[PDB]
Design a protein around this ligand. Sequence first.
Ligand SMILES: *[C@@H]1O[C@H](CO)[C@@H](O[C@@H]2O[C@H](CO)[C@@H](O[C@@H]3O[C@H](CO)[C@@H](O)[C@H](O[C@H]4O[C@H](CO)[C@@H](O)[C@H](O)[C@@H]4O[C@H]4O[C@H](CO)[C@@H](O)[C@H](O)[C@@H]4O)[C@@H]3O)[C@H](O)[C@H]2NC(C)=O)[C@H](O)[C@H]1NC(C)=O
Ligand SMILES: *[C@@H]1O[C@H](CO)[C@@H](O[C@@H]2O[C@H](CO)[C@@H](O)[C@H](O)[C@H]2NC(C)=O)[C@H](O)[C@H]1NC(C)=O
Ligand SMILES: *[C@@H]1O[C@H](CO)[C@@H](O[C@@H]2O[C@H](CO)[C@@H](O)[C@H](O)[C@H]2NC(C)=O)[C@H](O)[C@H]1NC(C)=O
Ligand SMILES: *[C@@H]1O[C@H](CO)[C@@H](O[C@@H]2O[C@H](CO)[C@@H](O)[C@H](O)[C@H]2NC(C)=O)[C@H](O)[C@H]1NC(C)=O
Ligand SMILES: *[C@@H]1O[C@H](CO)[C@@H](O[C@@H]2O[C@H](CO)[C@@H](O)[C@H](O)[C@H]2NC(C)=O)[C@H](O)[C@H]1NC(C)=O
Ligand SMILES: *[C@@H]1O[C@H](CO)[C@@H](O[C@@H]2O[C@H](CO)[C@@H](O)[C@H](O)[C@H]2NC(C)=O)[C@H](O)[C@H]1NC(C)=O
Ligand SMILES: *[C@@H]1O[C@H](CO)[C@@H](O[C@@H]2O[C@H](CO)[C@@H](O)[C@H](O)[C@H]2NC(C)=O)[C@H](O)[C@H]1NC(C)=O
Ligand SMILES: *[C@@H]1O[C@H](CO)[C@@H](O[C@@H]2O[C@H](CO)[C@@H](O)[C@H](O)[C@H]2NC(C)=O)[C@H](O)[C@H]1NC(C)=O
Ligand SMILES: *[C@@H]1O[C@H](CO)[C@@H](O)[C@H](O)[C@H]1NC(C)=O
Ligand SMILES: *[C@@H]1O[C@H](CO)[C@@H](O)[C@H](O)[C@H]1NC(C)=O
Ligand SMILES: *[C@@H]1O[C@H](CO)[C@@H](O)[C@H](O)[C@H]1NC(C)=O
Ligand SMILES: *[C@@H]1O[C@H](CO)[C@@H](O)[C@H](O)[C@H]1NC(C)=O
Ligand SMILES: *[C@@H]1O[C@H](CO)[C@@H](O)[C@H](O)[C@H]1NC(C)=O
Ligand SMILES: *[C@@H]1O[C@H](CO)[C@@H](O)[C@H](O)[C@H]1NC(C)=O
Ligand SMILES: *[C@@H]1O[C@H](CO)[C@@H](O)[C@H](O)[C@H]1NC(C)=O
Lengths: 128, 440, 43
Amino acid sequence: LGFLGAAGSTMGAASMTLTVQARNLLQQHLLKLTVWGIKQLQARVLAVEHYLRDQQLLGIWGCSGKLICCTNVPWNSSWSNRNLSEIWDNMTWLQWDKEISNYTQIIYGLLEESQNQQEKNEQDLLAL
Amino acid sequence: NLWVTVYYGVPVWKDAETTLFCASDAKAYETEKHNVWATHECVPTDPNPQEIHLENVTEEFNMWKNNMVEQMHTDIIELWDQSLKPCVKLTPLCVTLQCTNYAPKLRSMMRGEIKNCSFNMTTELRDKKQKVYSLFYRLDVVQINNKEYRLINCNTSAITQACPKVSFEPIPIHYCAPAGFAILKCKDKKFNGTGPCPSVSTVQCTHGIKPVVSTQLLLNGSLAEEEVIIRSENITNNAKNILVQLNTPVQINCTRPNNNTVKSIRIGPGQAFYYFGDVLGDVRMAHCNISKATWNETLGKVVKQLRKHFGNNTIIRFAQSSGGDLEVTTHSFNCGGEFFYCNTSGLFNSTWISDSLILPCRIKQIINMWQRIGQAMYAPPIQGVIRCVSNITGLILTRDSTTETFRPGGGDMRDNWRSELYKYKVVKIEPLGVAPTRCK
Amino acid sequence: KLRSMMRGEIKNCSFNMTTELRDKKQKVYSLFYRLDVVQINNK
Ligand SMILES: *[C@@H]1O[C@H](CO)[C@@H](O[C@@H]2O[C@H](CO)[C@@H](O[C@@H]3O[C@H](CO)[C@@H](O)[C@H](O[C@H]4O[C@H](CO)[C@@H](O)[C@H](O)[C@@H]4O[C@H]4O[C@H](CO)[C@@H](O)[C@H](O)[C@@H]4O)[C@@H]3O)[C@H](O)[C@H]2NC(C)=O)[C@H](O)[C@H]1NC(C)=O
Ligand SMILES: *[C@@H]1O[C@H](CO)[C@@H](O[C@@H]2O[C@H](CO)[C@@H](O)[C@H](O)[C@H]2NC(C)=O)[C@H](O)[C@H]1NC(C)=O
Ligand SMILES: *[C@@H]1O[C@H](CO)[C@@H](O[C@@H]2O[C@H](CO)[C@@H](O)[C@H](O)[C@H]2NC(C)=O)[C@H](O)[C@H]1NC(C)=O
Ligand SMILES: *[C@@H]1O[C@H](CO)[C@@H](O[C@@H]2O[C@H](CO)[C@@H](O)[C@H](O)[C@H]2NC(C)=O)[C@H](O)[C@H]1NC(C)=O
Ligand SMILES: *[C@@H]1O[C@H](CO)[C@@H](O[C@@H]2O[C@H](CO)[C@@H](O)[C@H](O)[C@H]2NC(C)=O)[C@H](O)[C@H]1NC(C)=O
Ligand SMILES: *[C@@H]1O[C@H](CO)[C@@H](O[C@@H]2O[C@H](CO)[C@@H](O)[C@H](O)[C@H]2NC(C)=O)[C@H](O)[C@H]1NC(C)=O
Ligand SMILES: *[C@@H]1O[C@H](CO)[C@@H](O[C@@H]2O[C@H](CO)[C@@H](O)[C@H](O)[C@H]2NC(C)=O)[C@H](O)[C@H]1NC(C)=O
Ligand SMILES: *[C@@H]1O[C@H](CO)[C@@H](O[C@@H]2O[C@H](CO)[C@@H](O)[C@H](O)[C@H]2NC(C)=O)[C@H](O)[C@H]1NC(C)=O
Ligand SMILES: *[C@@H]1O[C@H](CO)[C@@H](O)[C@H](O)[C@H]1NC(C)=O
Ligand SMILES: *[C@@H]1O[C@H](CO)[C@@H](O)[C@H](O)[C@H]1NC(C)=O
Ligand SMILES: *[C@@H]1O[C@H](CO)[C@@H](O)[C@H](O)[C@H]1NC(C)=O
Ligand SMILES: *[C@@H]1O[C@H](CO)[C@@H](O)[C@H](O)[C@H]1NC(C)=O
Ligand SMILES: *[C@@H]1O[C@H](CO)[C@@H](O)[C@H](O)[C@H]1NC(C)=O
Ligand SMILES: *[C@@H]1O[C@H](CO)[C@@H](O)[C@H](O)[C@H]1NC(C)=O
Ligand SMILES: *[C@@H]1O[C@H](CO)[C@@H](O)[C@H](O)[C@H]1NC(C)=O
């Protein structure tokens, strides 16, 4: 398809397109200062941290490197328990995402606590 | 039974504001060194128009809340201000002018229009002055009560010489978004202005935009594709203006048919300005032509689009514009060194029920761009004659029982660019996702 | 004609101020303070 090619597609169908989504991220050396040089300087900066802040988060979430990895925290079924075998390959990413959106903050702090706090101690506990 | 599974690279976005930058089509200019639009020090466009279609997905836009308008309208003022800075300030120009008419025996419309004038201009030495004969226009001088005349600016603003090597030709500008972002595209024909475009697609970098300045009409712009398309925000309000896009252009010819002469006088140690010295031949009005029968056929398409959702059993009356400044009254445009003011009363004298044409045109010298009281640019005169040929694309109207008055409006330059940015919006890519699956 | 501490404090003054035209000047009456002006030796 292409970059954002599987946008309105099945989540399982759009599972196998992640590489094209990640390649199409991040020129002219010797900038001046005048007008457009400001924006190109601003273009260089905003590409960095917006690449990087989530790249911090995968190290926070222990899922370092490109992996579709899964955690050890259970799914709370209070978060719209809707046929999670069926709906997982039915709708889209997109419309499903705003359904999740009211609780994503609650998830993330539990993610950095579940295996990232606990299961990152215990290999030192067996390191003897 | 289910555990949270993370996902990276999910195709999902939100809507956000971001900084956004130039993209030029790389040419070999090397003549005017740099124009007003800094095409130099801009990144060359990738000649690969990667335009990726989006299947079976919709998104409601709004052409009335594009922050891309407010970013660009900031930049056009600022680039204009940036290039205008390092040139000659005509501070000692604001003097008492002894003047008289230039062609005193003349019957035409140009009678009492060009004015011969006289100075005491400060030379490059401190204690040497100089009597200078020059020519000016009616729309540049003001009486004081060979009566004493005075320029307009000295009421309000100061004067900058307009750097007589640069140009003003509107280069097509592309807008590349930074990484981690995308630009949506509507692509739906007959798009309302605010609605879910079904046929969406996206690019990194938009198509060409010519930042032309124009009042009352939309010169040189982009065509439509199907028919006359009407857009506005609140069609029932009298405060919202009217955006019209046409499926076909009208070839307008415009000319300043005078063989002229430009002189030069050093007024400071390096300050040497150019002024409208003399006219060879004899004095001729500047005007513009238009195919009348084409334009009536063009305007006949318009009223059909009008009577669809407004005023079916109601006459449609066009009137001349009301009044105010010349920029909000008459057609005004630059055409490469000259600032025309063409009267358009001969295009809005018409009603409806159920062999060319000539517009007289005035020109100025001292320009107050974007209504900024405090800044005033003095354009230099141009030798030779002017032979501007242009299309037309759009029309800006306003609405004033079973009678309807449409007067031609304008004023805000930002409305020029909503005619070019309705096809786009800015999204922030989110490469995250968390779903429950069967693994622990 | 003032007896208080403010005696000889505010000073009426006169100018020839350049107007917006190059060859037009203007006589201007204004007020100033002791701590702004210096004598030169209606002085
Ligand atoms: C809408 O689009 C149309 C495109 O179809 C635009 O029409 C074009 O407009 C340009 C500029 O107005 C015009 O170019 C001129 O062509 C002449 C014939 O080839 C050239 O001789 C002339 O070049 C001179 O002027 C330029 C600007 O000053 C200089 O860059 C150039 O070096 C030349 O300058 C020398 O000569 C002059 C003569 O007086 C002298 O004073 C200078 O000092 C210097 O010595 C122009 O480039 C195109 O021909 C037009 N095309 C058509 C088909 O008409 C139209 O302008 C657009 N509408 C609007 C409103 O912009
Ligand atoms: C503007 O008016 C002045 C009036 O003095 C013109 O100057 C005189 O013009 C005649 C013929 O044109 C000459 O014979 C004189 O020598 C000029 N006087 C001076 C002092 O030079 C001037 O020509 C007019 N401007 C134009 C462009 O015609
Ligand atoms: C085109 O835009 C206009 C507004 O400029 C829409 O008009 C209103 O739309 C809302 C929501 O769709 C309705 O609740 C109103 O009843 C509409 N008013 C009128 C007078 O029509 C219009 O629906 C849009 N049309 C399309 C096809 O999107
Ligand atoms: C002005 O409009 C004319 C049409 O009236 C344009 O000419 C067409 O341009 C397209 C794109 O290059 C060509 O495919 C057509 O063949 C042209 N038609 C004719 C009759 O020449 C012209 O490009 C427009 N110019 C501007 C500056 O907008
Ligand atoms: C569009 O403008 C019209 C005015 O022409 C608005 O209609 C009136 O608005 C006032 C103030 O909100 C109300 O008191 C009237 O009752 C309205 N009249 C009608 C017939 O509704 C209208 O609200 C505006 N709509 C939008 C979306 O801006
Ligand atoms: C504007 O002027 C140009 C030339 O000055 C006109 O172009 C000519 O048009 C006629 C008929 O349309 C053709 O037969 C000629 O071959 C054209 N000549 C050139 C050099 O292009 C153009 O038609 C004028 N436009 C209007 C509306 O009058
Ligand atoms: C454009 O030309 C028309 C030519 O008629 C001007 O209209 C005249 O304006 C004067 C001044 O108000 C009136 O006294 C006349 O009655 C008008 N004529 C008609 C037929 O109505 C018009 O003023 C010009 N445009 C501008 C901006 O001055
Ligand atoms: C400053 O002193 C001058 C002295 O001339 C005052 O000017 C005169 O003031 C009287 C009465 O105040 C007027 O009748 C005269 O007409 C003024 N003369 C002129 C030339 O205007 C001036 O008033 C004093 N300043 C203040 C603030 O009182
Ligand atoms: C799931 O979320 C609800 C709130 O929506 C909360 O009351 C409940 O305790 C959560 N379940 C678990 C197992 O944490
Ligand atoms: C120029 O100066 C001379 C003498 O200073 C004066 O007679 C003449 O009126 C002045 N002309 C203008 C246009 O200022
Ligand atoms: C100065 O500006 C005022 C309004 O701001 C206007 O009425 C007046 O005519 C102007 N004077 C000149 C000489 O342009
Ligand atoms: C203008 O006058 C000059 C005088 O030498 C002549 O060479 C030139 O051809 C004229 N141009 C026009 C357009 O008449
Ligand atoms: C324009 O055309 C319409 C019909 O096509 C006609 O009724 C009208 O009189 C025409 N106007 C002019 C000025 O020719
Ligand atoms: C409109 O045109 C007619 C003739 O075509 C003329 O008699 C009338 O005065 C014009 N009115 C206006 C407002 O231009
Ligand atoms: C102002 O100028 C006039 C004449 O040039 C002179 O008589 C007067 O003393 C001057 N006053 C001041 C305050 O400079």
